Design a protein around this nucleic acid. Sequence first.
RNA 1: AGAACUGGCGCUGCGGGAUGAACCGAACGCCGGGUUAAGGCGCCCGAUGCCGACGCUCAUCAGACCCCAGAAAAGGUGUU
RNA 2: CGUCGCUUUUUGAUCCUUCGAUGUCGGCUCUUCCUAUCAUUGUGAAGCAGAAUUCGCCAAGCGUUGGAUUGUUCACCCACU
RNA 3: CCAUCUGUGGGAUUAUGACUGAACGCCUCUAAGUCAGAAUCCCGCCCAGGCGGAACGAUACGGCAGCGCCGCGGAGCCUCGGUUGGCCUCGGAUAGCCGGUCCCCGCCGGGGGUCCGGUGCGGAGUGCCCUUCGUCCUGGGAAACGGGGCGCGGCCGGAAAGGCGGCCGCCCCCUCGCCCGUCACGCACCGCACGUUCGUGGGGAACCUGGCGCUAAACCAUUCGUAGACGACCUGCUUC
Lengths: 139, 348, 109, 191, 195
Amino acid sequence: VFRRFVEVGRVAYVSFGPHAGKLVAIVDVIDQNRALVDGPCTQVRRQAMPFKCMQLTDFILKFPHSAHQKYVRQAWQKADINTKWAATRWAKKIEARERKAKMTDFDRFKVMKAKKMRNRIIKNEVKKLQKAALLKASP
Amino acid sequence: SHRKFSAPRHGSLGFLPRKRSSRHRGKVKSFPKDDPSKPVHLTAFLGYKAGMTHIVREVDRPGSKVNKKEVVEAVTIVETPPMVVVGIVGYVETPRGLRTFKTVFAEHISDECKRRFYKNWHKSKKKAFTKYCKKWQDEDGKKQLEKDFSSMKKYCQVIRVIAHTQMRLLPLRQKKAHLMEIQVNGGTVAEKLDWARERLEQQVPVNQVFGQDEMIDVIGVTKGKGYKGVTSRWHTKKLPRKTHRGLRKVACIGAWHPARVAFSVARAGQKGYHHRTEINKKIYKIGQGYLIKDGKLIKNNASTDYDLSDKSINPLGGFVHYGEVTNDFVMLKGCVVGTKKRVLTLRK
Amino acid sequence: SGRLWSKAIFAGYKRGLRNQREHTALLKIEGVYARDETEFYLGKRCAYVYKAKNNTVTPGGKPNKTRVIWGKVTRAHGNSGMVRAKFRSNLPAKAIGHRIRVMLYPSRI
Amino acid sequence: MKTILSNQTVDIPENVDITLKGRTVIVKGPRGTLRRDFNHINVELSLLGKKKKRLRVDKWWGNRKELATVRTICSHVQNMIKGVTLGFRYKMRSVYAHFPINVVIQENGSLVEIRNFLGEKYIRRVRMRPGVACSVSQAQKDELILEGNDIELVSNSAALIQQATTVKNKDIRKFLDGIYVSEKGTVQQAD
Amino acid sequence: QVLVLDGRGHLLGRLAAIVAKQVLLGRKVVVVRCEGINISGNFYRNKLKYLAFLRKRMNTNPSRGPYHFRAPSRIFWRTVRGMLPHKTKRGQAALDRLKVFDGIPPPYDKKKRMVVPAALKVVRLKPTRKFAYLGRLAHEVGWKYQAVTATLEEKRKEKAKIHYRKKKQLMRLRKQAEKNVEKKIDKYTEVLKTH
RNA sequence: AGAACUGGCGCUGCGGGAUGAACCGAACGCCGGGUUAAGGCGCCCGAUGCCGACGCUCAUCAGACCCCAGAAAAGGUGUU
RNA sequence: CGUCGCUUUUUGAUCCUUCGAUGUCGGCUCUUCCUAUCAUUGUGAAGCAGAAUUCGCCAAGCGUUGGAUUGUUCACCCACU
RNA sequence: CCAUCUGUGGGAUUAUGACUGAACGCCUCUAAGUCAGAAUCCCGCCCAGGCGGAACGAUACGGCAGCGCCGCGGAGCCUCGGUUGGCCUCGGAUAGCCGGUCCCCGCCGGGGGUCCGGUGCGGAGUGCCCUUCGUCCUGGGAAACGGGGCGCGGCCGGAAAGGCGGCCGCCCCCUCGCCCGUCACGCACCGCACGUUCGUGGGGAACCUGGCGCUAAACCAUUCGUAGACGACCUGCUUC
């Protein structure tokens, strides 16, 4: 229980505020409800974001306790976070979530035609697994 | 203010609508709630009180000063001919109380029964249940009549039995059956119901439901006293002699500042014919009366182990304003609600 | 084939606390729930559709039992994102809780 | 203050092993089992390590009145572990004046019928919580022994006797009668 | 058309505020299983301030005057009647839409219930503080049909667990059906466009 | 009960104070737009349906907005 | 010796309302309500050995009478409980 | 009360008393947790039963009428609201859901490994019909159910408001019900509002209209008096 903490060097997501959507790295905590973040390769500079603003990931880093901006920058890209943040099944969730809103209206038509084709195939094939689950036990 | 001498209440607020009951038969408010650990039986029963006599018993109460001595005690004897079970009703509870699930009547119904379902027997063509008895007889409804038992047994929770008096055996003018709906407190609800399936249109005496010295309750409708004012209805004090505008009133019927007459205060209205429920009457003697025809008529009632005369419980020349008791009876210690010639329902 | 408007329940009149102003309505339209995204709905032509006993037909041909009261969106109203409106008649005051029809008209897109 | 964290450490001996379905604690030992659920208290329980079974209940932020209850967790768990390896023997000793109190047990070691307390005609049925045991001590006058695993239910059992034999409307400084508890011990003595 | 509110886990006024506005907008709400409605504060305080309500009685006949209901069906209902302008006809007609029900009735058991996260016990109380049930205090005041609803709470929950048995059985195969062939020409337009 | 200075009701609506002569705003032809005042923004009731910020407080009689419609001495290992 | 209050069951202070009238002492009759409890239940404290009394808490469900004098509210007295 | 008869127990707790036990290494009835607990409090018992609801019975001929249930299309009158529906785990929130062996409940569901997922993607910010102009001509991919219905009849399922859901066996008939394309037509109504549904909605009146049935009652006058100020109630009436 409580599998991921806050810590000097925890990569944190930031869902809202004036810095919505980008990652940070906790540099030091100040007074329980707020903390000091910065990000070198994610374009958010060094400031104090509150904890109810942010959003924790799994990625810890190895920092000295509240070092300068350069010592975040190396250990960021020595860890290569944006690659390890790319192929996760949570950044695919936010990126899918933002694909669908900007979907142009012709692209809504292409989805609508080609969604029901795989519904008129899966529904017409899971009905046969209903047929084959009872021809088995027909004796 | 501050009365200067405390007085108790006159009357009871627990019986506050001093008002004619909506009914003539004593409706049972709450049958004793069934525990299925007991063998299967009834609770309630219909009977007509006739009059009162008295008794002499050898009291037996070790610890009292009355003991080992003759006591006269007031009894009341109640003529109870046997009932006939006609219908079964199952109830299922909801979160809004018990709801009447469905009914089943008898195969064929008697003559005084159908007279209850009409307000005028003469003008009517006596047509009740004449399109109901075909579905016991023809097979078309008959397989869906046992559907109505199969769905009875699973869902309903307390079953009650529609039975009524026999008026042919009673010396009155009335000849309408008093139809009731009485609860079986039997075992499991299949066998609570498999006892009443046996016995539609079959007679039931009182000595199966009740026994000797079983202490029962009486539910019935009180005296018709009329429309009587304050000091008679509520037994408030008469005013002193000097009083202008009346000896027999209550005087002060409220304060000022509640500018509104309270309900608590006594005032004129309708005295009697209320519904009441007497508690803890003792049965003394279950009676059987006027047996078979070979011994052409043996009467033999009013027979203790010490008087021992071929007598009859009705007095020398019939009861006053009743008639003549010919049937099974119940006799009960004390005074019991209701005028003579009036139905009252008994209850364990 | 197809519906071409937005469902919009009719919330009240632009009231103070005691007296109310009949000359402007206000509409909570279904879908917007903030002031940030009410900028689409400004200046849209909206209409209250109801029934009568008499027959008349504005468009088409054959008359019928249907008549309409026009109107248009004026401006936003409160951070909840409901919208004050301003019809060319005043409202029947039956319409409280009923919806109206808010079109896809007068586009700036 | 909202202190960061507080934590006690609870050791478990090797003949008893603790499993949890969440906040609920299931303890099984040599002489049976007993369980306590802490579904209201909002503190995580953490088992850690094989072969040794260190328990470490730790509470985060908290106000001080919720900080105070984490010691109550380890002081209730260490009366199940002791209660499932030893159990609690309660020795209540009857004191009486001129009337000797006489006492029996009818139902299997669970019901106690007390008579002639101070000179009454009235007997007292003190029915115990299900899970404890009666014992009249021999090789000793009028000593009553109560056993069982769970220290609540054994002491709830031992309270309903001490509270039933109470002298009313009198001096209770003098008129000292009753069935007073005297010693709460172990069943397996010194193990 | 109609929305259905599962009633358990909520607070009383923090739910009944939201219903009182949504019923003034011409909608139709049905609150279902209003027995497990909570109320903040400890229990004995919430039992004092309802016995304090029962001593309110007009001293010339109580048969007119404050009608103290007892069932938690009609306790949540009299709260919402407090928050609608019932003395005018616009507030009379905002009670022809709310139909509170206790337990889960058979017209309303086979619908997908909706809950309010704006009113829950998890969200709105601080977790270290004490909370009552609307059910068991209505057991304390007169609503004597408690167990014969908890008898029917399980008898609905029995037949609902056997639906979830076979809804996932009618869902376990369509994951096995999509492990078959020739659909990935139509996964191509959806993985690109939020499947 | 009686005064002094100045304002106010009387003679005067309206917004707010639940309600009211006198408080707080503010003074009036009839109207359409826009904005604020005192005030308010769970729902009656227009408006926080803000991812509002920081700490305090649990009552078995909680507390909850000038005049204003109920309180003191004294006390508490209830909590900061 | 002090000192802080509550209460409107006592009088007094004030004149706000009523002078084209609000029928004004006391008793008799009846209902309700408060609790600052005399009794009854649960209880705690004593200069509580028991009995008998006394102090506080929870508590208004139910009780709190019969008379001599007085026109009386009050007062006083016998008797009961 | 001047004669007699009867008068009803369950629960949550107050005060006080304890338990377990921290705060504060002990202690402590409390901070969390529990226990006993009474003329108070609520309920039952007891009295009335509402602009509340059931179940069930009986449902109007004579001489011509007349009335239900089912099948009807024709016209007219009135009331209006809506514009696709989601067919259901339990609960937890200092925690949770998925799929899955071992040993258990009459060949399913129950307990433990282990494996996934987790700011919920087996995600009501989601899902499925779908935004379906219609049709022809024609070719590729998907397809062996055909699917509406006057169906025909059977079956059990769901009582807390069952008014609701599936299956089987035949059948006028469909072999064009969907995706990707070939080809060409229908009011293409000359820029413009109330269009698109629900729904052959809810109401009551009458005519041409098939098949099935249906032959009552209440109230009053009359009588009684278990009852009554008048109404109300209680009863009676057979040509035996």
